[PDB]
Amino acid sequence: GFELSKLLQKEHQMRKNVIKHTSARHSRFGGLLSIQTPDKTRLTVSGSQALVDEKIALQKLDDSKKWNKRIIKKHQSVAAEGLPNSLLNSQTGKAIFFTESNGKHFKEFINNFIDSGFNILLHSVTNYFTTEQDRMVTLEQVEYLLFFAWFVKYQLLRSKIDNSADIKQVSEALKEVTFILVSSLLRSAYDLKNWTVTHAGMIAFNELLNLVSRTKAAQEEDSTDIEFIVSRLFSDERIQLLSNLPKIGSKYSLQFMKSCIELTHSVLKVLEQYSDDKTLVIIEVNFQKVQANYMTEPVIETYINFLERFRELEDDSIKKVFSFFHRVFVQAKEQALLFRFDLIILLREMLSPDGLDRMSRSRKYVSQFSDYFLARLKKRLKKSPAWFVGLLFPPLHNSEVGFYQRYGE
Amino acid sequence: EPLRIIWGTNVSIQECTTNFRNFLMSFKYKFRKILDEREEFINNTTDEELYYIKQLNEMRELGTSNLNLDARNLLAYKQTEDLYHQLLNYPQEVISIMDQTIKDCMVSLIVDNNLDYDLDEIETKFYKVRPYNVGSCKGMRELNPNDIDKLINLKGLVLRSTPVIPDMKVAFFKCNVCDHTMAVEIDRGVIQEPARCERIDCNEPNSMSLIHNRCSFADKQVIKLQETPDFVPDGQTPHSISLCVYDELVDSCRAGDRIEVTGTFRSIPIRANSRQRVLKSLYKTYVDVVHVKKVITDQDLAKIREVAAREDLYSLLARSIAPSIYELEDVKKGILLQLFGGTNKTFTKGGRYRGDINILLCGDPSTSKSQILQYVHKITPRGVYTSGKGSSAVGLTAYITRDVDTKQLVLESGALVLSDGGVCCIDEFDKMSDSTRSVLHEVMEQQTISIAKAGIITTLNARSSILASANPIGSRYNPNLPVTENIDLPPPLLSRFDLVYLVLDKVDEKNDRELAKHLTNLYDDVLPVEFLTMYISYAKEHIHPIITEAAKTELVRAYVGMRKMGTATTRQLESMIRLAEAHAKMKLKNVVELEDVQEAVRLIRSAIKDY
Amino acid sequence: VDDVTGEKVREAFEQFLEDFSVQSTEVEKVYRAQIEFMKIYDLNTIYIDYQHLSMRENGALAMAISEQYYRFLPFLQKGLRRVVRKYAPELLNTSTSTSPEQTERVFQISFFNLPTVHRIRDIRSEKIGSLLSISGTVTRTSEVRPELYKASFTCDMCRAIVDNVEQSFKYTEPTFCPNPSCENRAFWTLNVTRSRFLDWQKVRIQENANEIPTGSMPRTLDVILRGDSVERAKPGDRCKFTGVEIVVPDVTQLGLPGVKPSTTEGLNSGVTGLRSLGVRDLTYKISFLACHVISIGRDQEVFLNSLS
Amino acid sequence: LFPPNLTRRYFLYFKPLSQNCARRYRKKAISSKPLSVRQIKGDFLGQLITVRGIITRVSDVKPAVEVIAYTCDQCGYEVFQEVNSRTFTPLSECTSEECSQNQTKGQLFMSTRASKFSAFQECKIQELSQQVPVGHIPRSLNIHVNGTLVRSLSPGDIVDVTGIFLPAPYTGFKALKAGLLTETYLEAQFVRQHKDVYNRLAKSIAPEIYGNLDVKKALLLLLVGGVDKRVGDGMKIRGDINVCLMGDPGVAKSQLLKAICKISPRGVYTTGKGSSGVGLTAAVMKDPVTDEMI
Amino acid sequence: VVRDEEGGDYTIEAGALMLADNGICCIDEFDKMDISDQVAIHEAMEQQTISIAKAGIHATLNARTSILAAANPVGGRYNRKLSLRGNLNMTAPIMSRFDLF
DNA sequence: GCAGATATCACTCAGCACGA
DNA sequence: TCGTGCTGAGTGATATCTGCTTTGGGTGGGTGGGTGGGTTGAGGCAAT
Ligand SMILES: Nc1ncnc2c1ncn2[C@@H]1O[C@H](COP(=O)(O)OP(=O)(O)OP(=O)(O)O)[C@@H](O)[C@H]1O
Numbered sequence A: 001g002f003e004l005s006k007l008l009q010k011e012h013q014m015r016k017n018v019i020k021h022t023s024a025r026h027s028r029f030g031g032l033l034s035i036q037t038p039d040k041t042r043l044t045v046s047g048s049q050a051l052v053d054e055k056i057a058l059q060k061l062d063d064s065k066k067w068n069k070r071i072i073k074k075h076q077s078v079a080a081e082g083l084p085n086s087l088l089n090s091q092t093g094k095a096i097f098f099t100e101s102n103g104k105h106f107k108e109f110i111n112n113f114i115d116s117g118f119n120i121l122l123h124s125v126t127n128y129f130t131t132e133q134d135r136m137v138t139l140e141q142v143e144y145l146l147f148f149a150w151f152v153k154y155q156l157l158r159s160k161i162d163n164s165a166d167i168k169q170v171s172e173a174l175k176e177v178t179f180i181l182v183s184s185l186l187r188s189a190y191d192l193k194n195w196t197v198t199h200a201g202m203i204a205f206n207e208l209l210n211l212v213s214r215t216k217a218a219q220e221e222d223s224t225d226i227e228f229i230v231s232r233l234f235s236d237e238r239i240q241l242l243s244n245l246p247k248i249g250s251k252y253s254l255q256f257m258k259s260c261i262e263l264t265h266s267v268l269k270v271l272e273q274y275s276d277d278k279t280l281v282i283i284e285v286n287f288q289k290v291q292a293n294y295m296t297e298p299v300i301e302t303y304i305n306f307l308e309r310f311r312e313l314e315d316d317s318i319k320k321v322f323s324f325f326h327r328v329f330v331q332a333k334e335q336a337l338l339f340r341f342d343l344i345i346l347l348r349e350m351l352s353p354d355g356l357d358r359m360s361r362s363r364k365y366v367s368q369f370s371d372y373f374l375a376r377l378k379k380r381l382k383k384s385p386a387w388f389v390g391l392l393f394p395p396l397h398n399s400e401v402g403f404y405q406r407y408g409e
Numbered sequence B: 001e002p003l004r005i006i007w008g009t010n011v012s013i014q015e016c017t018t019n020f021r022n023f024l025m026s027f028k029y030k031f032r033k034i035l036d037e038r039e040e041f042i043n044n045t046t047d048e049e050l051y052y053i054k055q056l057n058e059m060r061e062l063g064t065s066n067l068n069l070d071a072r073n074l075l076a077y078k079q080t081e082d083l084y085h086q087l088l089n090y091p092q093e094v095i096s097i098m099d100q101t102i103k104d105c106m107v108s109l110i111v112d113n114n115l116d117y118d119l120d121e122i123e124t125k126f127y128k129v130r131p132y133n134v135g136s137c138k139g140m141r142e143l144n145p146n147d148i149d150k151l152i153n154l155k156g157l158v159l160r161s162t163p164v165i166p167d168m169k170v171a172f173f174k175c176n177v178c179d180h181t182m183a184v185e186i187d188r189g190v191i192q193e194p195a196r197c198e199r200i201d202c203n204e205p206n207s208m209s210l211i212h213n214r215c216s217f218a219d220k221q222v223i224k225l226q227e228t229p230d231f232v233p234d235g236q237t238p239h240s241i242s243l244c245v246y247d248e249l250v251d252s253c254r255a256g257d258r259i260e261v262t263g264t265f266r267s268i269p270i271r272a273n274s275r276q277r278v279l280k281s282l283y284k285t286y287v288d289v290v291h292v293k294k295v296i297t298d299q300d301l302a303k304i305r306e307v308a309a310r311e312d313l314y315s316l317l318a319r320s321i322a323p324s325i326y327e328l329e330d331v332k333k334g335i336l337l338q339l340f341g342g343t344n345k346t347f348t349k350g351g352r353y354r355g356d357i358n359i360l361l362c363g364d365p366s367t368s369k370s371q372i373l374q375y376v377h378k379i380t381p382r383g384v385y386t387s388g389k390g391s392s393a394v395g396l397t398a399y400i401t402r403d404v405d406t407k408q409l410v411l412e413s414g415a416l417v418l419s420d421g422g423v424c425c426i427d428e429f430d431k432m433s434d435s436t437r438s439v440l441h442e443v444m445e446q447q448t449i450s451i452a453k454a455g456i457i458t459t460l461n462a463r464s465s466i467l468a469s470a471n472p473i474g475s476r477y478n479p480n481l482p483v484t485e486n487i488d489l490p491p492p493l494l495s496r497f498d499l500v501y502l503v504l505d506k507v508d509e510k511n512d513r514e515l516a517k518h519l520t521n522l523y524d525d526v527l528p529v530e531f532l533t534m535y536i537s538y539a540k541e542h543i544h545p546i547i548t549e550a551a552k553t554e555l556v557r558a559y560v561g562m563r564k565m566g567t568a569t570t571r572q573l574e575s576m577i578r579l580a581e582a583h584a585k586m587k588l589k590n591v592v593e594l595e596d597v598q599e600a601v602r603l604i605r606s607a608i609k610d611y
Numbered sequence C: 001v002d003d004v005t006g007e008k009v010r011e012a013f014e015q016f017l018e019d020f021s022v023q024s025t026e027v028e029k030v031y032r033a034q035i036e037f038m039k040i041y042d043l044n045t046i047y048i049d050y051q052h053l054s055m056r057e058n059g060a061l062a063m064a065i066s067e068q069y070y071r072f073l074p075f076l077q078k079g080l081r082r083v084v085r086k087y088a089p090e091l092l093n094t095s096t097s098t099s100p101e102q103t104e105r106v107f108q109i110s111f112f113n114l115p116t117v118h119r120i121r122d123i124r125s126e127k128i129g130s131l132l133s134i135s136g137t138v139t140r141t142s143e144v145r146p147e148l149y150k151a152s153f154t155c156d157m158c159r160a161i162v163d164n165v166e167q168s169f170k171y172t173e174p175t176f177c178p179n180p181s182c183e184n185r186a187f188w189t190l191n192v193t194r195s196r197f198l199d200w201q202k203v204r205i206q207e208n209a210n211e212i213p214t215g216s217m218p219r220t221l222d223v224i225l226r227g228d229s230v231e232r233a234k235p236g237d238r239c240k241f242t243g244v245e246i247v248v249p250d251v252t253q254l255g256l257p258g259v260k261p262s263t264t265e266g267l268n269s270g271v272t273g274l275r276s277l278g279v280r281d282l283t284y285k286i287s288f289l290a291c292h293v294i295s296i297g298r299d300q301e302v303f304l305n306s307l308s
Numbered sequence D: 001l002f003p004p005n006l007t008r009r010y011f012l013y014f015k016p017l018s019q020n021c022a023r024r025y026r027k028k029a030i031s032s033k034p035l036s037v038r039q040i041k042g043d044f045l046g047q048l049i050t051v052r053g054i055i056t057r058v059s060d061v062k063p064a065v066e067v068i069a070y071t072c073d074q075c076g077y078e079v080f081q082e083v084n085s086r087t088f089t090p091l092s093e094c095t096s097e098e099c100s101q102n103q104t105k106g107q108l109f110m111s112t113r114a115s116k117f118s119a120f121q122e123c124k125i126q127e128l129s130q131q132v133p134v135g136h137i138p139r140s141l142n143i144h145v146n147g148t149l150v151r152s153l154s155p156g157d158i159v160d161v162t163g164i165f166l167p168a169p170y171t172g173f174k175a176l177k178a179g180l181l182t183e184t185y186l187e188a189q190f191v192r193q194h195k196d197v198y199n200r201l202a203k204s205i206a207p208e209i210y211g212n213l214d215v216k217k218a219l220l221l222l223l224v225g226g227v228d229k230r231v232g233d234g235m236k237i238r239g240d241i242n243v244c245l246m247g248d249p250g251v252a253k254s255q256l257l258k259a260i261c262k263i264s265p266r267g268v269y270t271t272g273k274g275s276s277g278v279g280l281t282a283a284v285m286k287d288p289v290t291d292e293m294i
Numbered sequence E: 001v002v003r004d005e006e007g008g009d010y011t012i013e014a015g016a017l018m019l020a021d022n023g024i025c026c027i028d029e030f031d032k033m034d035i036s037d038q039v040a041i042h043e044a045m046e047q048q049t050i051s052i053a054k055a056g057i058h059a060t061l062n063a064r065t066s067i068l069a070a071a072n073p074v075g076g077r078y079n080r081k082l083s084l085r086g087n088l089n090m091t092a093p094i095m096s097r098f099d100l101f
Numbered sequence F: 001g002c003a004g005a006t007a008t009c010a011c012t013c014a015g016c017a018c019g020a
Numbered sequence G: 001t002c003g004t005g006c007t008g009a010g011t012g013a014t015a016t017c018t019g020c021t022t023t024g025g026g027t028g029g030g031t032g033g034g035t036g037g038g039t040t041g042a043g044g045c046a047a048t
């Protein structure tokens, strides 16, 4: 009942926002508006609501246009590659609804299994498939990685919710052999351009990073052993691969981009934690250089493309994308990267009354990031008149003026 | 800074909005009086107050989304002189601007006043303005092409209205693949349909379908208006003009009513055939209606209660009902008690008892009988002036017919049925075939008519009072012979009537002199009819007398005495009951006293006349 | 994309149907007992009192079902089916030798005891798709007809099968053949044997005479009865219907196989713009889908048994 | 830029050539010479002629569109289309040079506020009883009135209308199946209308009748209809002086009746039975075609 | 017999004596009824069946109804001297049909 | 000759892999 | 670290095509025309 009331209250707010765009009179009432642009020319826009608000008039003028630019989306079903429907291709929000009794039984069964024999099963499977790495077929790789990731995530959530349970039940997760196996599979997938297993390995790596961070936070003294494992998983080749992963993710499915966001956030958090705590050595690792490797145009393009679907997104994803935006904007002072136009349109769409819900948690982050970006952009534009044209086309790569273009000096 | 401008003109919409907001914010009725050269009529309470602010506050308290506007008020103000012409010449844009400004004014009033009223109700409510009194009333035969797309004022008689028609407002589309739902608006009767799904992940083209039962709808109705008979120049078929009314104005005017309508005189093409875009060169003309006008306060109640205290109220009302008729006080009194009527009784374990009084006015020809009939016909809210030999048995009760538009068997309402709750009037009762008179037997007894013929078996309520007149068989009334001989009509029928008066034109040197002096002055105050109608309506609606023991104790005596002297049947006792109840209604009493029943019996004996 | 609000309403309806109880002279589950009654006596319709709905869950469920009934109706049926599966599994399927005809039972939900009763003249377009009750006099009653509920077609090229096609208001045929190789797009044959049908009856009602204004033509309306509520209303008598106010389009314009397309003096022009309506316009007509009907007005042993 | 007809706000009409002018200057007038619907043949098509007859039907004024104005939601440009036929096809896509150079598919939408309209009336004219040959039935000719001449013709009137006799070519598929037969009409251009006191005004009620002086005085009083009808608070007193003339056959009653009844501007001579089937007062009859009591 | 709605074929429409099958029918003013209508209820009173042979509608319906009626005298009041048949314009058959007076 | 529903063909554009 | 030639893919405009009637009924007419066709029977009501 409470959930239904909340959903009805949200739908009522949406209806109220929609009502603002509808005319009191009927469709055939008539009424033509003539809006004159500064160059002494007037365009005719119909509709009663366009008469009072100029934004509605411009929006209707926009919508009346017929020609649409191409968008080609070549996507392959899981059945094509012989894989079953799973989190890889399902919607971010698709939830299987359970009755109280069935949900309780499912929780009890999963809890008993995790408390009983997850470690032994993982040990046996990882040893067997380390003996037989070569003949692995995509189905088995994806299934194993997904099982690992799901169980690690569930254990993490259970530990966070209550302290009665223990976090050592997934001890085999931190065991070296499993980590080497996962890294080898991910590297092979990247080399052979097998994107499905690549996505599965990305999810598994995200889960491993979450687990390592949580265990280090719980016990820092015993983390000295954990410090051994982190040194392995941040190899130069691995760092390059992780840096490149977001770059290619732009032209792929939404779930892949979500996994890219998750992995990038987790990697950045772990790297910051370890750099602050002690001297990170794989070659000493400084957070500045790894951060710089992550500031590139394709990364921002991928992030913008991800945030274009904010309507179907969750609060956590919005928070993470805006946290990364804040990092790029402030921590490294690379505002030139975010001085694009797609970001402006997206910000106005999300802050519009018909856009993201006003009484929502994410709107606070959106408003703060806007305020800051608008202030900095106004300052830069006042300083540099030429940026009035730079907002449209991509940044230059010319040595003579590249430095002035980016840093303004 | 693009400037919004109405198409084809040079009026800035922002100027219109600000001027209308200022006019609504600060307007006092004193300006209207000043404009009409009525300066000396300005008071200090009503004319010194913000009119439209009170109108909007009353709207909010009553939860309404309508504000009737007067153009002469716009002319009264200073900043809205040009707005009157703009409204007259470009009605659609100005009306939309006024609606939006009214909504903005309500929102600003709520926000600034810091009231506790929730903003949700006002935010989701559509507000509409209904201007009227926009100038002289044009004739239905004077609308030229020059007056297309301009605000006009019309008056006519409603002839026929179609049932409610649903008109789409917002369409609803659902993607067949991803089950994604979106709503799109309708402009100029065209759906702005999408080519492909608006979602990014799913872009399958031509996969969107219209869900008919989830689209928002509005109300539409089409009316036919016939010009008033007076406007007809040389006695031809009166012209007709079609009207369209939406939302609130639907089901506001019934068939056969005189209305004054303000709207836009629109024009629209007619397609030559169903399966082509081709259009006829001749355009159809019609009117888009924006306002319709069909042509008690505590102070009045305090005033009405003052009259009731007057000792000579009976004489005042009897003298005011028919001012012109001279020296017929008893006839007037009898007529008045019919308007008030008896008391209504709802009665299970039996049948309903209705307090309706029937009066017969039979007498010598030249006496004022038909004049009183017309006088009462004017006062009553409902009634049919049926005559003798001009009405039929079926015509009085009901006529079985068929509806061409619906092709279904329907029945019309006859003269008696059309008078439900009023007072029927008949002029020449004697000059009526007994076949038709037999219909009145059931009306006066059961207050209902039952019809069973040609597959229609139903009963129509005819709860109406009958007021008939008759003339003597001879050229005059002869006192020598008894009543049953002089007036005709079956003897039993005369017993049904509650009161049967007898007015005769005796010859005298003083009565004739006074009558002649009274009917020649045309070439003792009386209440204005407007107030009298309100008086009788209030008495008929609120008051409900209840008999007392003292009434019964002497009513039994009166009835038994009436029967002892001898025609006198139970109907006479029921008539006494009804008359006693009716007279109590006049004085606004909830209990019938001995005096009222004494007056009733006094009236009954002195009607037939106390030889 | 799933409808979160619909699923939440489904869960709330399931909980109400499961745990609701009313104190008797003992306390018993009214609706679980009713479901058991149907299971024993093989009934399709399950009657639900609206006052009980309003009482539970602060009335939010009642508001959701009443304000938007056409939207939420399928979810209510899903919840009812889930509850029936939980408690009376055998009721789901339709009821010397084996019988292969075991089709899914088409449950119907009937709502009654609405707090307010309307009139034919009070029907408005603002309340299309809302749960409301009306009263009227039955003037006509069409014969019982079978209505195509869920068709099943076979391709004319490869002889495939496409089943569970939903008909909205007209004869709807598939568009794309499920077989990847086949090129058929508009040639199909209806499998009249494997399809499913519902009983259908149209009833015309006019407003009661006393309610009418003096000297006014009564207003008529069309009412549709389905399932077990057929041949319940009879000509002449006065009945109280409860259901959902729907609007029926002019199916001829939408495109019907075989049929050709197509007071007010040309002012009754519909809405145009759809791809199906290349140049034609669609006009609407209000109707009423009724789920509940109420009639306002041998030997000795048989009568004695009825008497208590 | 815009079509010339759009800016025009005047109507041009032709006045026929009067007979006096033609005879003055030694010429023959064909236009003014009145004709009858019978004599209007196909040879006169496309000429200015005059027709004499009685109007038997008129229609309500309706706006006939002459120049339609459209507006492109993209350009801001207006497109004007001339219509000179009984039917036309609306424009869909903008033809402006802006929509051409950019090749934008802007949509044109009709705007009745900027179009041009002309008042239109359709009437019928029929032959008089003096022009129908024996054994023949009267014929009717349609008349079209445009511009300011509208409302100058009313039912039941004898007129001399001068106009252009033109055909009305069919359009669409109807043209192919209709054949070569042409439906014609008349475009009205000019319309010409064929238009002791007591004792003295008493002996002049019917000078021919000899006697009955007092009766004639009474009929004069009837003619005056002497009254000052008085209406007070509702009472109405009749203001009509009814009179009857009884007697024996031979005395001048019917002659007096028709004279007195012609004198007044309005009168109706009828027998005691009534005006044909309907008797004096009124009567309700079943409609032969609609079967509705009228 | 009235033509079928949306049909060219005739059909039988029930009447007062049909809707009152196995029931009581009430007539308020028997005398005022026309002679043509009075003879209509002659078969339904005794035979308890209605036979109509109108347009292509040959049928024999059943009306097992009890009819109760109220009538006024020939004049205004009941005449003591005159007999029952004298007071009422009803003839011998209808009076014989009636069970009680 | 004219409008509408339908299907055909040709042209041009965004991705891809390799070579510079 | 990156630039460009080849390819599959999908709309846009344009080619053929069917159709150009259609229909029972008097608020669709008779200057649209009968080679496009329309063939009741009971019951109610005014006149008398
Ligand atoms: N005083 C008179 N002066 C002139 N002619 C007269 C006079 N008296 C009678 N006539 C002639 O008497 C003839 C009588 O015919 P008329 O048409 O008047 O019939 P009527 O008897 O008056 O008519 P009805 O009886 O039908 O009302 C008329 O030709 C009239 O000219």
Ligand SMILES: Nc1ncnc2c1ncn2[C@@H]1O[C@H](COP(=O)(O)OP(=O)(O)O)[C@@H](O)[C@H]1O
Pocket: B324, B325, B326, B327, B364, B365, B366, B367, B368, B369, B370, B371, B515, B519, D237
């Ligand atoms: N007492 C009276 N008061 C006023 N007018 C009277 C009176 N008596 C007679 N008249 C006049 O005499 C006329 C009688 O005509 P009318 O009332 O039509 O008589 P009836 O209707 O009885 O035939 C009326 O026009 C009225 O002006």
Ligand SMILES: [Mg+2]
Pocket: B369, B370, B427, B469
């Ligand atoms: Mg009179």
Ligand SMILES: [Mg+2]
Pocket: D253, D254
């Ligand atoms: Mg004569």
Ligand SMILES: [Zn+2]
Pocket: B175, B176, B177, B178, B179, B180, B197, B198, B199, B202, B203, B204
């Ligand atoms: Zn979609």
Ligand SMILES: [Zn+2]
Pocket: C155, C156, C157, C158, C159, C160, C177, C178, C179, C182, C183, C184
């Ligand atoms: Zn197939």
Ligand SMILES: [Zn+2]
Pocket: D072, D073, D074, D075, D076, D077, D094, D095, D096, D098, D099, D106, D107
């Ligand atoms: Zn254009």
